[PDB]
Amino acid sequence: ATKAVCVLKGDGPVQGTIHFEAKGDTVVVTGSITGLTEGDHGFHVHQFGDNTQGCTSAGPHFNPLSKKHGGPKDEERHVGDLGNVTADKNGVAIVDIVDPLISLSGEYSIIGRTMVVHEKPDDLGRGGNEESTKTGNAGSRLACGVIGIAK
Amino acid sequence: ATKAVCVLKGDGPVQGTIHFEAKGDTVVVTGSITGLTEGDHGFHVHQFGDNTQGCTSAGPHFNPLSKKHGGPKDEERHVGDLGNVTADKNGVAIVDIVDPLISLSGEYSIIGRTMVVHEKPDDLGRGGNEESTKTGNAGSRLACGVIGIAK
Ligand SMILES: [Ca+2]
Ligand SMILES: [Ca+2]
Ligand SMILES: [Cu+2]
Ligand SMILES: [Cu+2]
Ligand SMILES: [Zn+2]
Ligand SMILES: [Zn+2]
């Protein structure tokens, strides 16, 4: 698979559609998220594509290599650590990330896993608390969706 | 992946949760669907896990071997053809299928694709019109979900 799509939804007003496309040895993630409070929101690929208990059953960040929580540009980061998206004043976040770690096939494949958008910004593991090294203190999961194969 | 899960949701009352487990060399599909009208309803794996236009964007039946539609027991069938599930008088359908063609990894993997429950019975490719050889005349998509990796 070279294209994927995720439809984010939650208990609230956050909603959005993320598109993934494999370009070379990177995956280009695009799309928009709306209903967000202006500012930065933790944006990560969680391990399971299980929406049976809302975004909760998505588990922790996808971390096949058992590293610590980082930001996208770090070497020591979870495969699903894609940092933060930024809602403008209108609550709209435009996603445009290019990641060399997440994949649409193979072991780091995120197909069948969940994209989660958080309440707070991802502190990128530079927070000075244990929590920061586990989730970046991004807090609650506002919206999430299972990543599926797209035409 | 050895376990997958799918939450079916639609525009109506139909909803359910389907679990998939790789047991031996086969895949066991279990779960239950509620809100259905009594009787049989086509139940198939559609190609795309694209819920951007509701269940419509799930595409046609997953058919990597390019065959015509049939029942789960036919040799000539799509990989996503899981037949019919049957709702009791209260609208509850209990799902219990063992299928030899779907898988949770490799070419026949349904991870990242969409489980769809239909409005009418699937005629198993024997209704005698062209539509029967494509969708079994199962009609519209009542509920659907992207199949994700479960713990
Ligand atoms: Ca919080
Ligand atoms: Ca119909
Ligand atoms: Cu997260
Ligand atoms: Cu179908
Ligand atoms: Zn992380
Ligand atoms: Zn079919």
PDB file of C-alpha atoms and ligand atoms in Angstrom:
ATOM      1  CA  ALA A   1       0.000   0.000   0.000  1.00  0.00           C
ATOM      2  CA  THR A   2       1.143   3.491  -0.989  1.00  0.00           C
ATOM      3  CA  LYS A   3      -1.866   5.591   0.024  1.00  0.00           C
ATOM      4  CA  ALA A   4      -3.773   5.634   3.293  1.00  0.00           C
ATOM      5  CA  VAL A   5      -6.498   7.789   4.816  1.00  0.00           C
ATOM      6  CA  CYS A   6      -7.703   8.449   8.333  1.00  0.00           C
ATOM      7  CA  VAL A   7     -10.957  10.083   9.432  1.00  0.00           C
ATOM      8  CA  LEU A   8     -10.584  11.599  12.885  1.00  0.00           C
ATOM      9  CA  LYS A   9     -13.568  11.841  15.150  1.00  0.00           C
ATOM     10  CA  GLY A  10     -14.138  11.971  18.879  1.00  0.00           C
ATOM     11  CA  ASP A  11     -16.700  12.651  21.573  1.00  0.00           C
ATOM     12  CA  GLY A  12     -16.441  16.357  20.799  1.00  0.00           C
ATOM     13  CA  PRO A  13     -16.190  18.752  17.893  1.00  0.00           C
ATOM     14  CA  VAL A  14     -12.685  17.869  16.761  1.00  0.00           C
ATOM     15  CA  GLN A  15     -12.931  16.203  13.365  1.00  0.00           C
ATOM     16  CA  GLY A  16     -10.548  15.877  10.423  1.00  0.00           C
ATOM     17  CA  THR A  17      -9.290  13.810   7.504  1.00  0.00           C
ATOM     18  CA  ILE A  18      -5.589  12.927   7.163  1.00  0.00           C
ATOM     19  CA  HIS A  19      -4.096  11.497   3.956  1.00  0.00           C
ATOM     20  CA  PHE A  20      -0.885   9.518   3.837  1.00  0.00           C
ATOM     21  CA  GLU A  21       1.137   8.843   0.708  1.00  0.00           C
ATOM     22  CA  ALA A  22       4.419   6.954   0.431  1.00  0.00           C
ATOM     23  CA  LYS A  23       6.903   9.102  -1.540  1.00  0.00           C
ATOM     24  CA  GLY A  24      10.283   7.350  -1.668  1.00  0.00           C
ATOM     25  CA  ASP A  25      11.413   6.314   1.782  1.00  0.00           C
ATOM     26  CA  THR A  26       9.203   8.829   3.457  1.00  0.00           C
ATOM     27  CA  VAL A  27       5.474   9.128   4.037  1.00  0.00           C
ATOM     28  CA  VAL A  28       3.875  12.502   3.346  1.00  0.00           C
ATOM     29  CA  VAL A  29       0.963  13.211   5.721  1.00  0.00           C
ATOM     30  CA  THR A  30      -1.528  15.934   4.729  1.00  0.00           C
ATOM     31  CA  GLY A  31      -5.082  16.959   5.562  1.00  0.00           C
ATOM     32  CA  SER A  32      -6.795  19.328   7.980  1.00  0.00           C
ATOM     33  CA  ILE A  33      -8.275  19.087  11.489  1.00  0.00           C
ATOM     34  CA  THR A  34     -10.961  21.483  12.723  1.00  0.00           C
ATOM     35  CA  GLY A  35     -12.710  22.343  15.998  1.00  0.00           C
ATOM     36  CA  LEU A  36      -9.345  22.598  17.710  1.00  0.00           C
ATOM     37  CA  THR A  37      -8.486  25.267  20.295  1.00  0.00           C
ATOM     38  CA  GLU A  38      -5.842  27.498  18.630  1.00  0.00           C
ATOM     39  CA  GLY A  39      -2.314  26.340  19.396  1.00  0.00           C
ATOM     40  CA  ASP A  40      -0.312  23.161  19.265  1.00  0.00           C
ATOM     41  CA  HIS A  41      -1.777  19.706  19.634  1.00  0.00           C
ATOM     42  CA  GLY A  42       0.058  16.409  20.101  1.00  0.00           C
ATOM     43  CA  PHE A  43      -0.389  14.392  16.860  1.00  0.00           C
ATOM     44  CA  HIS A  44       0.616  10.739  17.101  1.00  0.00           C
ATOM     45  CA  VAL A  45       0.158   7.233  15.677  1.00  0.00           C
ATOM     46  CA  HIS A  46      -0.984   5.045  18.564  1.00  0.00           C
ATOM     47  CA  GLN A  47      -0.381   1.318  18.505  1.00  0.00           C
ATOM     48  CA  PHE A  48      -3.780  -0.313  18.043  1.00  0.00           C
ATOM     49  CA  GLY A  49      -6.516   0.388  15.527  1.00  0.00           C
ATOM     50  CA  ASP A  50      -9.038  -0.518  18.228  1.00  0.00           C
ATOM     51  CA  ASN A  51     -11.827   2.047  18.576  1.00  0.00           C
ATOM     52  CA  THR A  52     -14.005  -0.148  20.748  1.00  0.00           C
ATOM     53  CA  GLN A  53     -13.523   2.117  23.816  1.00  0.00           C
ATOM     54  CA  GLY A  54     -13.163   5.345  21.836  1.00  0.00           C
ATOM     55  CA  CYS A  55      -9.547   6.659  21.522  1.00  0.00           C
ATOM     56  CA  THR A  56      -8.620   5.019  24.800  1.00  0.00           C
ATOM     57  CA  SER A  57      -8.291   1.524  23.335  1.00  0.00           C
ATOM     58  CA  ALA A  58      -5.784   2.797  20.731  1.00  0.00           C
ATOM     59  CA  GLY A  59      -3.090   2.109  23.346  1.00  0.00           C
ATOM     60  CA  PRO A  60       0.219   3.948  23.611  1.00  0.00           C
ATOM     61  CA  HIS A  61       2.226   5.533  20.858  1.00  0.00           C
ATOM     62  CA  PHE A  62       3.370   3.076  18.209  1.00  0.00           C
ATOM     63  CA  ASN A  63       6.934   2.336  19.394  1.00  0.00           C
ATOM     64  CA  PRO A  64       8.152  -0.833  17.716  1.00  0.00           C
ATOM     65  CA  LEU A  65      11.777   0.006  18.626  1.00  0.00           C
ATOM     66  CA  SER A  66      11.038   0.654  22.292  1.00  0.00           C
ATOM     67  CA  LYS A  67      12.538   4.139  22.321  1.00  0.00           C
ATOM     68  CA  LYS A  68      11.485   7.088  24.414  1.00  0.00           C
ATOM     69  CA  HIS A  69       9.016   9.768  23.382  1.00  0.00           C
ATOM     70  CA  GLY A  70      10.610  12.341  21.148  1.00  0.00           C
ATOM     71  CA  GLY A  71       9.637  14.804  18.406  1.00  0.00           C
ATOM     72  CA  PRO A  72       9.715  13.921  14.711  1.00  0.00           C
ATOM     73  CA  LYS A  73      13.232  15.152  14.130  1.00  0.00           C
ATOM     74  CA  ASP A  74      14.839  13.204  16.985  1.00  0.00           C
ATOM     75  CA  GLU A  75      16.502   9.786  16.586  1.00  0.00           C
ATOM     76  CA  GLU A  76      15.228   8.656  19.969  1.00  0.00           C
ATOM     77  CA  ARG A  77      11.495   8.959  19.334  1.00  0.00           C
ATOM     78  CA  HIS A  78       8.605   6.531  19.005  1.00  0.00           C
ATOM     79  CA  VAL A  79       7.782   5.593  15.367  1.00  0.00           C
ATOM     80  CA  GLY A  80       4.425   7.274  15.911  1.00  0.00           C
ATOM     81  CA  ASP A  81       5.799  10.567  17.308  1.00  0.00           C
ATOM     82  CA  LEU A  82       4.846  13.086  14.658  1.00  0.00           C
ATOM     83  CA  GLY A  83       5.018  16.010  16.978  1.00  0.00           C
ATOM     84  CA  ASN A  84       2.383  18.707  16.924  1.00  0.00           C
ATOM     85  CA  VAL A  85      -0.222  20.187  14.665  1.00  0.00           C
ATOM     86  CA  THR A  86      -1.223  23.834  15.162  1.00  0.00           C
ATOM     87  CA  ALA A  87      -4.765  25.065  15.242  1.00  0.00           C
ATOM     88  CA  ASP A  88      -5.169  28.649  14.042  1.00  0.00           C
ATOM     89  CA  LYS A  89      -7.613  31.019  15.806  1.00  0.00           C
ATOM     90  CA  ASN A  90     -10.493  29.475  13.850  1.00  0.00           C
ATOM     91  CA  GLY A  91      -9.482  26.095  15.293  1.00  0.00           C
ATOM     92  CA  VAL A  92      -8.143  24.757  12.055  1.00  0.00           C
ATOM     93  CA  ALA A  93      -4.962  22.773  11.789  1.00  0.00           C
ATOM     94  CA  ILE A  94      -3.497  22.148   8.346  1.00  0.00           C
ATOM     95  CA  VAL A  95      -1.377  18.993   8.385  1.00  0.00           C
ATOM     96  CA  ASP A  96       1.670  18.758   6.188  1.00  0.00           C
ATOM     97  CA  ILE A  97       4.365  16.465   7.567  1.00  0.00           C
ATOM     98  CA  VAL A  98       6.942  14.328   5.773  1.00  0.00           C
ATOM     99  CA  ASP A  99       8.198  11.494   7.963  1.00  0.00           C
ATOM    100  CA  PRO A 100      10.921   9.010   7.234  1.00  0.00           C
ATOM    101  CA  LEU A 101      10.051   6.657  10.075  1.00  0.00           C
ATOM    102  CA  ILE A 102       6.333   5.915   9.740  1.00  0.00           C
ATOM    103  CA  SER A 103       5.611   3.559   6.859  1.00  0.00           C
ATOM    104  CA  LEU A 104       2.669   2.314   4.834  1.00  0.00           C
ATOM    105  CA  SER A 105       4.167  -1.187   4.610  1.00  0.00           C
ATOM    106  CA  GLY A 106       6.550  -3.521   6.395  1.00  0.00           C
ATOM    107  CA  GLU A 107       7.242  -3.608  10.125  1.00  0.00           C
ATOM    108  CA  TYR A 108       6.691   0.079  10.828  1.00  0.00           C
ATOM    109  CA  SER A 109       3.466  -0.081   8.907  1.00  0.00           C
ATOM    110  CA  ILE A 110       0.861   2.153  10.472  1.00  0.00           C
ATOM    111  CA  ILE A 111      -2.016   0.759   8.360  1.00  0.00           C
ATOM    112  CA  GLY A 112      -4.611  -0.547  10.815  1.00  0.00           C
ATOM    113  CA  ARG A 113      -3.328   1.703  13.601  1.00  0.00           C
ATOM    114  CA  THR A 114      -4.876   4.873  15.051  1.00  0.00           C
ATOM    115  CA  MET A 115      -3.999   8.553  14.397  1.00  0.00           C
ATOM    116  CA  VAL A 116      -4.770  10.468  17.670  1.00  0.00           C
ATOM    117  CA  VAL A 117      -4.932  14.318  17.965  1.00  0.00           C
ATOM    118  CA  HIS A 118      -4.381  15.612  21.496  1.00  0.00           C
ATOM    119  CA  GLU A 119      -5.812  18.250  23.745  1.00  0.00           C
ATOM    120  CA  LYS A 120      -2.462  19.808  24.652  1.00  0.00           C
ATOM    121  CA  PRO A 121       0.813  20.247  22.745  1.00  0.00           C
ATOM    122  CA  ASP A 122       3.407  17.531  22.655  1.00  0.00           C
ATOM    123  CA  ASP A 123       6.308  18.704  24.887  1.00  0.00           C
ATOM    124  CA  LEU A 124       8.524  16.524  22.700  1.00  0.00           C
ATOM    125  CA  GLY A 125       9.981  14.581  25.587  1.00  0.00           C
ATOM    126  CA  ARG A 126      11.760  17.760  26.745  1.00  0.00           C
ATOM    127  CA  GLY A 127       9.393  18.315  29.646  1.00  0.00           C
ATOM    128  CA  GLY A 128      11.335  17.446  32.773  1.00  0.00           C
ATOM    129  CA  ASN A 129       8.861  14.908  34.102  1.00  0.00           C
ATOM    130  CA  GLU A 130       8.532  11.175  33.444  1.00  0.00           C
ATOM    131  CA  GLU A 131       5.254  11.716  31.611  1.00  0.00           C
ATOM    132  CA  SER A 132       7.055  13.832  29.081  1.00  0.00           C
ATOM    133  CA  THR A 133       9.279  10.913  28.121  1.00  0.00           C
ATOM    134  CA  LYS A 134       6.252   8.676  27.616  1.00  0.00           C
ATOM    135  CA  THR A 135       3.637  10.847  25.918  1.00  0.00           C
ATOM    136  CA  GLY A 136       5.036  14.398  25.690  1.00  0.00           C
ATOM    137  CA  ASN A 137       2.326  15.460  28.085  1.00  0.00           C
ATOM    138  CA  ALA A 138      -0.166  15.893  25.171  1.00  0.00           C
ATOM    139  CA  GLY A 139      -2.999  15.005  27.506  1.00  0.00           C
ATOM    140  CA  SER A 140      -6.398  13.761  26.423  1.00  0.00           C
ATOM    141  CA  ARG A 141      -7.217  12.336  23.001  1.00  0.00           C
ATOM    142  CA  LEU A 142      -9.672  14.596  21.251  1.00  0.00           C
ATOM    143  CA  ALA A 143     -10.289  12.724  18.030  1.00  0.00           C
ATOM    144  CA  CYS A 144      -8.895   9.543  16.483  1.00  0.00           C
ATOM    145  CA  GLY A 145      -9.440   7.199  13.544  1.00  0.00           C
ATOM    146  CA  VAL A 146      -8.095   3.902  12.232  1.00  0.00           C
ATOM    147  CA  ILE A 147      -5.704   4.368   9.307  1.00  0.00           C
ATOM    148  CA  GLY A 148      -7.003   2.544   6.268  1.00  0.00           C
ATOM    149  CA  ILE A 149      -5.801   1.724   2.783  1.00  0.00           C
ATOM    150  CA  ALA A 150      -6.901   4.371   0.295  1.00  0.00           C
ATOM    151  CA  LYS A 151      -7.287   4.173  -3.471  1.00  0.00           C
TER     152      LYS A 151
ATOM    153  CA  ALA B   1      -0.976  -9.015  13.335  1.00  0.00           C
ATOM    154  CA  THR B   2      -2.854 -11.939  14.852  1.00  0.00           C
ATOM    155  CA  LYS B   3      -5.885 -10.038  16.142  1.00  0.00           C
ATOM    156  CA  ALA B   4      -7.939  -7.341  14.446  1.00  0.00           C
ATOM    157  CA  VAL B   5     -11.121  -5.514  15.367  1.00  0.00           C
ATOM    158  CA  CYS B   6     -13.658  -3.415  13.540  1.00  0.00           C
ATOM    159  CA  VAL B   7     -16.349  -1.133  14.952  1.00  0.00           C
ATOM    160  CA  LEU B   8     -19.268  -0.876  12.540  1.00  0.00           C
ATOM    161  CA  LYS B   9     -21.083   2.424  12.427  1.00  0.00           C
ATOM    162  CA  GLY B  10     -23.436   3.946   9.878  1.00  0.00           C
ATOM    163  CA  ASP B  11     -25.992   6.722   9.469  1.00  0.00           C
ATOM    164  CA  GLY B  12     -28.658   4.592  11.081  1.00  0.00           C
ATOM    165  CA  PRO B  13     -29.085   2.369  14.075  1.00  0.00           C
ATOM    166  CA  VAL B  14     -26.905  -0.464  12.839  1.00  0.00           C
ATOM    167  CA  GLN B  15     -23.792  -0.956  14.839  1.00  0.00           C
ATOM    168  CA  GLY B  16     -21.519  -3.702  16.022  1.00  0.00           C
ATOM    169  CA  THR B  17     -18.065  -4.906  16.758  1.00  0.00           C
ATOM    170  CA  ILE B  18     -16.328  -7.592  14.781  1.00  0.00           C
ATOM    171  CA  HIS B  19     -13.215  -9.396  15.984  1.00  0.00           C
ATOM    172  CA  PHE B  20     -10.801 -11.286  13.826  1.00  0.00           C
ATOM    173  CA  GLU B  21      -8.263 -13.756  15.085  1.00  0.00           C
ATOM    174  CA  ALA B  22      -5.620 -15.758  13.222  1.00  0.00           C
ATOM    175  CA  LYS B  23      -6.026 -19.261  14.703  1.00  0.00           C
ATOM    176  CA  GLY B  24      -3.762 -21.788  13.010  1.00  0.00           C
ATOM    177  CA  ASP B  25      -3.709 -21.077   9.328  1.00  0.00           C
ATOM    178  CA  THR B  26      -7.230 -19.673   9.337  1.00  0.00           C
ATOM    179  CA  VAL B  27      -9.046 -16.512  10.436  1.00  0.00           C
ATOM    180  CA  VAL B  28     -11.929 -16.609  12.877  1.00  0.00           C
ATOM    181  CA  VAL B  29     -14.398 -13.723  12.672  1.00  0.00           C
ATOM    182  CA  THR B  30     -16.729 -13.273  15.654  1.00  0.00           C
ATOM    183  CA  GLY B  31     -18.867 -10.423  17.008  1.00  0.00           C
ATOM    184  CA  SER B  32     -22.427  -9.220  16.896  1.00  0.00           C
ATOM    185  CA  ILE B  33     -24.334  -6.538  15.032  1.00  0.00           C
ATOM    186  CA  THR B  34     -27.518  -4.884  16.348  1.00  0.00           C
ATOM    187  CA  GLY B  35     -30.164  -2.621  14.873  1.00  0.00           C
ATOM    188  CA  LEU B  36     -30.669  -4.806  11.790  1.00  0.00           C
ATOM    189  CA  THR B  37     -33.975  -5.835  10.226  1.00  0.00           C
ATOM    190  CA  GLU B  38     -34.675  -9.534  10.797  1.00  0.00           C
ATOM    191  CA  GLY B  39     -33.221 -11.813   8.141  1.00  0.00           C
ATOM    192  CA  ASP B  40     -30.026 -12.056   6.142  1.00  0.00           C
ATOM    193  CA  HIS B  41     -27.683  -9.186   5.350  1.00  0.00           C
ATOM    194  CA  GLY B  42     -24.660  -9.342   3.030  1.00  0.00           C
ATOM    195  CA  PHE B  43     -21.381  -9.038   4.994  1.00  0.00           C
ATOM    196  CA  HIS B  44     -18.277  -8.368   2.999  1.00  0.00           C
ATOM    197  CA  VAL B  45     -14.751  -6.951   3.229  1.00  0.00           C
ATOM    198  CA  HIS B  46     -14.512  -3.992   0.855  1.00  0.00           C
ATOM    199  CA  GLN B  47     -11.257  -2.948  -0.641  1.00  0.00           C
ATOM    200  CA  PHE B  48     -10.515   0.455   0.866  1.00  0.00           C
ATOM    201  CA  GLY B  49     -10.427   1.492   4.503  1.00  0.00           C
ATOM    202  CA  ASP B  50     -11.617   4.941   3.323  1.00  0.00           C
ATOM    203  CA  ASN B  51     -14.458   6.241   5.450  1.00  0.00           C
ATOM    204  CA  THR B  52     -14.231   9.755   4.017  1.00  0.00           C
ATOM    205  CA  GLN B  53     -17.588   9.408   2.245  1.00  0.00           C
ATOM    206  CA  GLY B  54     -19.166   7.091   4.855  1.00  0.00           C
ATOM    207  CA  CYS B  55     -19.252   3.494   3.602  1.00  0.00           C
ATOM    208  CA  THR B  56     -19.381   4.506  -0.050  1.00  0.00           C
ATOM    209  CA  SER B  57     -15.722   5.252  -0.267  1.00  0.00           C
ATOM    210  CA  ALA B  58     -14.908   1.679   0.857  1.00  0.00           C
ATOM    211  CA  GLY B  59     -14.910   0.738  -2.822  1.00  0.00           C
ATOM    212  CA  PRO B  60     -15.946  -2.665  -4.224  1.00  0.00           C
ATOM    213  CA  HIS B  61     -15.390  -6.096  -2.621  1.00  0.00           C
ATOM    214  CA  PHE B  62     -11.749  -6.866  -1.826  1.00  0.00           C
ATOM    215  CA  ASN B  63     -10.833  -9.044  -4.796  1.00  0.00           C
ATOM    216  CA  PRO B  64      -7.104  -9.512  -5.274  1.00  0.00           C
ATOM    217  CA  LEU B  65      -7.625 -12.597  -7.485  1.00  0.00           C
ATOM    218  CA  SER B  66     -10.099 -10.815  -9.774  1.00  0.00           C
ATOM    219  CA  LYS B  67     -12.926 -13.244  -9.574  1.00  0.00           C
ATOM    220  CA  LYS B  68     -16.689 -12.686  -9.666  1.00  0.00           C
ATOM    221  CA  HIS B  69     -18.806 -12.540  -6.533  1.00  0.00           C
ATOM    222  CA  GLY B  70     -19.872 -15.737  -4.843  1.00  0.00           C
ATOM    223  CA  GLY B  71     -20.638 -17.170  -1.449  1.00  0.00           C
ATOM    224  CA  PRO B  72     -17.935 -17.948   1.093  1.00  0.00           C
ATOM    225  CA  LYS B  73     -18.044 -21.606   0.173  1.00  0.00           C
ATOM    226  CA  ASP B  74     -17.582 -21.092  -3.539  1.00  0.00           C
ATOM    227  CA  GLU B  75     -14.274 -21.406  -5.341  1.00  0.00           C
ATOM    228  CA  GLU B  76     -15.283 -18.471  -7.530  1.00  0.00           C
ATOM    229  CA  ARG B  77     -15.720 -15.661  -5.031  1.00  0.00           C
ATOM    230  CA  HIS B  78     -14.029 -12.405  -4.024  1.00  0.00           C
ATOM    231  CA  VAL B  79     -11.695 -12.623  -1.009  1.00  0.00           C
ATOM    232  CA  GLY B  80     -14.034 -10.202   0.835  1.00  0.00           C
ATOM    233  CA  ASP B  81     -17.129 -12.358   0.351  1.00  0.00           C
ATOM    234  CA  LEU B  82     -18.189 -13.551   3.754  1.00  0.00           C
ATOM    235  CA  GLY B  83     -21.772 -14.267   2.837  1.00  0.00           C
ATOM    236  CA  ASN B  84     -24.665 -13.241   4.994  1.00  0.00           C
ATOM    237  CA  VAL B  85     -25.087 -12.709   8.672  1.00  0.00           C
ATOM    238  CA  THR B  86     -28.594 -13.323  10.036  1.00  0.00           C
ATOM    239  CA  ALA B  87     -30.428 -10.979  12.392  1.00  0.00           C
ATOM    240  CA  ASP B  88     -32.979 -12.451  14.791  1.00  0.00           C
ATOM    241  CA  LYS B  89     -36.382 -10.838  15.380  1.00  0.00           C
ATOM    242  CA  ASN B  90     -34.776  -8.273  17.660  1.00  0.00           C
ATOM    243  CA  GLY B  91     -32.314  -7.174  14.975  1.00  0.00           C
ATOM    244  CA  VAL B  92     -29.290  -8.925  16.497  1.00  0.00           C
ATOM    245  CA  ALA B  93     -26.908 -10.915  14.320  1.00  0.00           C
ATOM    246  CA  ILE B  94     -24.261 -13.122  15.930  1.00  0.00           C
ATOM    247  CA  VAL B  95     -21.175 -13.459  13.781  1.00  0.00           C
ATOM    248  CA  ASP B  96     -19.159 -16.642  13.742  1.00  0.00           C
ATOM    249  CA  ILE B  97     -17.279 -17.308  10.529  1.00  0.00           C
ATOM    250  CA  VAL B  98     -14.077 -19.211   9.771  1.00  0.00           C
ATOM    251  CA  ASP B  99     -12.733 -18.198   6.388  1.00  0.00           C
ATOM    252  CA  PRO B 100      -9.922 -19.658   4.308  1.00  0.00           C
ATOM    253  CA  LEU B 101      -9.224 -16.725   2.001  1.00  0.00           C
ATOM    254  CA  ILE B 102      -8.928 -13.614   4.204  1.00  0.00           C
ATOM    255  CA  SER B 103      -5.816 -13.142   6.336  1.00  0.00           C
ATOM    256  CA  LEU B 104      -4.363 -10.606   8.781  1.00  0.00           C
ATOM    257  CA  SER B 105      -1.088 -10.263   6.923  1.00  0.00           C
ATOM    258  CA  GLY B 106       0.332 -10.545   3.449  1.00  0.00           C
ATOM    259  CA  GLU B 107      -1.464 -10.304   0.136  1.00  0.00           C
ATOM    260  CA  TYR B 108      -4.827 -11.305   1.534  1.00  0.00           C
ATOM    261  CA  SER B 109      -4.660  -9.088   4.577  1.00  0.00           C
ATOM    262  CA  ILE B 110      -7.844  -7.251   5.382  1.00  0.00           C
ATOM    263  CA  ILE B 111      -6.134  -4.985   7.944  1.00  0.00           C
ATOM    264  CA  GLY B 112      -6.844  -1.425   6.913  1.00  0.00           C
ATOM    265  CA  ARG B 113      -9.819  -2.399   4.753  1.00  0.00           C
ATOM    266  CA  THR B 114     -13.526  -1.998   5.508  1.00  0.00           C
ATOM    267  CA  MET B 115     -16.071  -4.468   6.896  1.00  0.00           C
ATOM    268  CA  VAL B 116     -19.523  -3.617   5.489  1.00  0.00           C
ATOM    269  CA  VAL B 117     -22.949  -4.940   6.580  1.00  0.00           C
ATOM    270  CA  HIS B 118     -25.608  -4.602   3.911  1.00  0.00           C
ATOM    271  CA  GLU B 119     -29.248  -3.789   3.676  1.00  0.00           C
ATOM    272  CA  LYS B 120     -30.336  -6.943   1.786  1.00  0.00           C
ATOM    273  CA  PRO B 121     -29.320 -10.623   1.632  1.00  0.00           C
ATOM    274  CA  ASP B 122     -26.313 -11.461  -0.511  1.00  0.00           C
ATOM    275  CA  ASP B 123     -27.574 -13.770  -3.297  1.00  0.00           C
ATOM    276  CA  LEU B 124     -24.159 -15.418  -3.458  1.00  0.00           C
ATOM    277  CA  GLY B 125     -23.494 -14.621  -7.070  1.00  0.00           C
ATOM    278  CA  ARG B 126     -26.523 -16.663  -8.228  1.00  0.00           C
ATOM    279  CA  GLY B 127     -29.256 -14.013  -8.827  1.00  0.00           C
ATOM    280  CA  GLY B 128     -28.707 -14.113 -12.581  1.00  0.00           C
ATOM    281  CA  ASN B 129     -28.115 -10.474 -13.387  1.00  0.00           C
ATOM    282  CA  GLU B 130     -24.739  -8.757 -13.746  1.00  0.00           C
ATOM    283  CA  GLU B 131     -25.147  -7.045 -10.384  1.00  0.00           C
ATOM    284  CA  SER B 132     -25.250 -10.490  -8.698  1.00  0.00           C
ATOM    285  CA  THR B 133     -21.746 -11.209 -10.014  1.00  0.00           C
ATOM    286  CA  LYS B 134     -20.455  -7.980  -8.453  1.00  0.00           C
ATOM    287  CA  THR B 135     -22.256  -7.455  -5.171  1.00  0.00           C
ATOM    288  CA  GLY B 136     -24.715 -10.270  -4.798  1.00  0.00           C
ATOM    289  CA  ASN B 137     -27.557  -7.689  -4.970  1.00  0.00           C
ATOM    290  CA  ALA B 138     -26.835  -6.991  -1.286  1.00  0.00           C
ATOM    291  CA  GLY B 139     -27.743  -3.378  -1.803  1.00  0.00           C
ATOM    292  CA  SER B 140     -26.785  -0.468   0.333  1.00  0.00           C
ATOM    293  CA  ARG B 141     -24.200  -0.280   3.082  1.00  0.00           C
ATOM    294  CA  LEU B 142     -25.889   0.027   6.449  1.00  0.00           C
ATOM    295  CA  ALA B 143     -22.759   0.218   8.612  1.00  0.00           C
ATOM    296  CA  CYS B 144     -19.015  -0.132   8.112  1.00  0.00           C
ATOM    297  CA  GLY B 145     -15.710   0.265   9.924  1.00  0.00           C
ATOM    298  CA  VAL B 146     -11.991   0.226   9.180  1.00  0.00           C
ATOM    299  CA  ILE B 147     -10.399  -3.004  10.294  1.00  0.00           C
ATOM    300  CA  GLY B 148      -7.604  -2.283  12.745  1.00  0.00           C
ATOM    301  CA  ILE B 149      -4.915  -4.105  14.707  1.00  0.00           C
ATOM    302  CA  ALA B 150      -6.089  -5.191  18.116  1.00  0.00           C
ATOM    303  CA  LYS B 151      -4.062  -6.116  21.182  1.00  0.00           C
TER     304      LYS B 151
HETATM  305 CA    CA C   1      -5.598  16.671  29.224  1.00  0.00          CA
HETATM  306 CA    CA C   2     -30.468  -1.445  -0.521  1.00  0.00          CA
HETATM  307 CU    CU C   3      -0.533  10.524  21.373  1.00  0.00          CU
HETATM  308 CU    CU C   4     -20.492  -5.694   0.120  1.00  0.00          CU
HETATM  309 ZN    ZN C   5       5.594   9.103  21.645  1.00  0.00          ZN
HETATM  310 ZN    ZN C   6     -18.148  -9.993  -3.599  1.00  0.00          ZN
END
